[PDB]
């Protein structure tokens, strides 16, 4: 019913999407900590043990 | 002489007042033209309507 501007809605929606991309780019690092295997196959031995 | 002074001054007073009404109506039309494209609210358009009234 147009109680706020279309432009202020566009700016707030831009802030929404521009913070949602920051959540994506900060979730990429949590996916990097659990080190996913890049390809399927037979793994050798762990060069670094836990703690290093 | 009262009637002569009032007939002498009310033409200038109403010319000034009609120029005020015309300037406030142009300000309302420009606030409407900012409202129609979307950069301005509806409450500021209503403030311009009430200054016109």
From Swiss-Prot, chain A:
Subunit relationships: Component of the MexAB-OprM multidrug efflux complex, composed of six MexA subunits forming a hexameric tube, binding to a MexB trimer, which interact with the trimeric OprM outer membrane channel protein. OprM is thought to not directly contact MexB; instead, MexA joins MexB and OprM by forming a funnel-like hexamer anchored to the inner membrane. MexA may initially form a hexameric ring complex with MexB prior to OprM, then OprM undergoes a conformational change as it contacts MexA, allowing the periplasmic gate to open.
Record annotation: effect of changing residue 45 to D: Abolishes complex formation and thereby decreases drug resistance
Other noteworthy facts: In both X-ray crystal structures approximately the last 100 residues are not ordered.
Task of the protein: The periplasmic linker component of the MexAB-OprM efflux system that confers multidrug resistance. Functions as the major efflux pump for n-hexane and p-xylene efflux. Has been shown in one study to be involved in the active efflux of the autoinducer N-(3-oxododecanoyl) homoserine lactone, thereby playing an indirect role in quorum-sensing; but has been shown in another study not to be involved in efflux of this autoinducer. Over-expression of the pump increases antibiotic and solvent efflux capacities. Implicated in the secretion of the siderophore pyoverdine.
Organism: Pseudomonas aeruginosa (strain ATCC 15692 / DSM 22644 / CIP 104116 / JCM 14847 / LMG 12228 / 1C / PRS 101 / PAO1)
Description of what induces expression: By growth under severe iron limitation.
Gene behind this protein: mexA
Transmembrane region(s): none
Disruption phenotype: Disruption of MexA, MexB and OprM significantly reduces active efflux of N-(3-oxododecanoyl) homoserine lactone/3-oxo-C12-HSL/PAI-1, but not N-butyryl homoserine lactone/C4-HSL/PAI-2.
Domain of life (superkingdom): Bacteria
The name this protein goes by in its record: Multidrug resistance protein MexA
Similarity comment text for this entry: Belongs to the membrane fusion protein (MFP) (TC 8.A.1) family.
Compartments it resides in: Cell inner membrane
Swiss-Prot record, chain B:
Induction (UniProt): By growth under severe iron limitation.
Subcellular location: Cell outer membrane
Disruption phenotype: Disruption of MexA, MexB and OprM significantly reduces active efflux of N-(3-oxododecanoyl) homoserine lactone/3-oxo-C12-HSL/PAI-1, but not N-butyryl homoserine lactone/C4-HSL/PAI-2.
Domain of life, source organism: Bacteria
Family: Belongs to the outer membrane factor (OMF) (TC 1.B.17) family.
Task of the protein: The outer membrane component of the MexAB-OprM efflux system that confers multidrug resistance. Functions as the major efflux pump for n-hexane and p-xylene efflux. Has been shown in one study to be involved in the active efflux of the autoinducer N-(3-oxododecanoyl) homoserine lactone, thereby playing an indirect role in quorum-sensing; but has been shown in another study not to be involved in efflux of this autoinducer. Over-expression of the pump increases antibiotic and solvent efflux capacities.
Subunit architecture: Component of the MexAB-OprM multidrug efflux complex, composed of six MexA subunits forming a hexameric tube, binding to a MexB trimer, which interact with the trimeric OprM outer membrane channel protein. The OprM homotrimer forms a 135 Angstroms-long pore. It consists of a beta-barrel, which is probably inserted in the outer membrane, and an alpha-barrel formed by alpha-helices which probably spans the periplasm. In the ground state the periplasmic end is closed, while the outer membrane end opening is 6-8 Angstroms in diameter.
Protein name (database record): Outer membrane protein OprM
Organism for this UniProt entry: Pseudomonas aeruginosa (strain ATCC 15692 / DSM 22644 / CIP 104116 / JCM 14847 / LMG 12228 / 1C / PRS 101 / PAO1)
Originating gene: oprM
């Amino acid at each position: 019913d147009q109680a706020v501007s279309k432009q202020q809605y566009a700016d707030a929606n831009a802030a929404y999407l521009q913070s949602k991309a920051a959540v994506e780019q900060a979730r990429i690092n949590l996916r990097y900590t659990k080190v996913l295997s890049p390809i399927s196959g037979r793994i050798g031995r762990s060069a670094v043990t836990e703690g290093a | 002489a009262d009637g002569l002074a009032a007939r002498g001054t009310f033409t200038e007073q109403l010319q000034a007042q009609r120029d005020l009404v015309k300037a406030s109506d142009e300000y309302y039309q420009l606030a409407d033209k900012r409202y129609r494209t979307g950069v301005d609210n509806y409450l500021t358009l209503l403030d311009a309507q009430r200054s016109l009234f």
